[PDB]
Predict the structure of Calmodulin-like domain protein kinase isoenzyme gamma, related.
Amino acid sequence: STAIFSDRYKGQRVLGKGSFGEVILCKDKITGQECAVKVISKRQVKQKTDKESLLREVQLLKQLDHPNIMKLYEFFEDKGYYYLVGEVYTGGELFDEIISRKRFSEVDAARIIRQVLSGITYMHKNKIVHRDLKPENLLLESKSKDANIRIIDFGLSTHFEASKKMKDKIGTAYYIAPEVLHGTYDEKCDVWSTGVILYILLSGCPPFNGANEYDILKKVEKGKYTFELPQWKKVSESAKDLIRKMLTYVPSMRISARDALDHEWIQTYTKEQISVDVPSLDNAILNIRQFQGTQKLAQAALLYMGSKLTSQDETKELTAIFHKMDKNGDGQLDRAELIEGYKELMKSMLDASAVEHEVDQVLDAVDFDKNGYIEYSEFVTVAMDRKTLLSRERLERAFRMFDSDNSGKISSSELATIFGVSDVDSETWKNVLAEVDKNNDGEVDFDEFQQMLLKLCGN
Ligand SMILES: CCOc1ccc2cc(-c3nn(CC4CCN(C)CC4)c4ncnc(N)c34)ccc2c1
């Protein structure tokens, strides 16, 4: 008598959007236990393996316990999706915590990387590979300063094919091992990705960089990088040595995770007391804040455009569904019919209970309430404005966070960087600017930027 996810768990709120789908904060309807549920849509995400292979991996993952690996509790499957139920962590992504600090040293970076290597070492002993390791996959257990790191998504890449949409692969190219690109890879690919992360922690710049995804990959495939940035003069020789060993091109010659744990640099800078020479890496922390702000604004711009395209689709679809449900032809509908069409639109709303409450938030939001006969036209406007909120609000937030000098504007040099990261062709975005403001002087305010994004998604 195979069990059913929504019989045991109720959705509370959305936590985020990650690799392969949405992560939802959920609650056990009996015990009250809160959990983070990754919901994988079978239609959007193709499987690479067979069901037998996926179920065996899940059964193994549930039995593993390590302080630096996200704990998986439960797995469910229905007709339309897969549900992975794990422990919820509230510290956010590591890099977003790092940029809030005013002090950051080699000791802080070694504490960090020792946890990651310790988690990876354990999973490789159990023959599980991550493959897609990156800063976004490093969560902090809690918002405390002393918080442990938890790696998420260990093992999913083997069974599910990653999205080819740019909104989903932002900041993936920097960390992928070169052997992964060419097809023959093993567990050493996780040491490479960790090496890239360490390079960034100590310099604030990716070792392999470029103006678009494909230029970055051309750099990764060649394998060449350097330590001639000025801020490497402040960094121990020991740390550089570990990096060279992790970023070794030929995987059989690259250091193992387990050996990396024993490296002098990890042994020296993780002893809690000895500060033999420990400066603060001020340039690095500010490079990381620039890096992070750039990536967050490009990501928010793509989700803004995506949300605007969805709201065009859903507005028209919902209107045609309501039109056909309107047997009177008077343009009015009752509550149950509004619920029925919104559910028909279906295909965060994990059960019928989720839908009824969204509709109720909109019927409350219909300003003042007359009960029986509701103007389907206005419900559509408000239901959809609701859906875009998180993404327009988030767009402005990310613009303000990128504009660190509070100038109110972003330069065309900055736009080139942002649109390169978002993979929007150069000729295309300038044509668009030229049409928004025929007189501009190489910089745009938030409203102009916003108008550019709308033109770049056909509005
Ligand atoms: C086999 C593992 O299956 C799972 C189960 C739960 C998961 C949960 C998360 C997760 N994802 N998230 C939030 C988003 C994860 C992706 N980031 C880019 C944005 C935040 C979580 N927040 C708190 N706790 C969590 N557990 C998560 C990520 C991957 C998961 C994979």
Remarks:
- Residues 291-459 form one domain.
- The chain has three domains: 1-90+154-161, 91-153+162-290, 291-459.
- Residues 282-325 form the longest helix (44 residues).
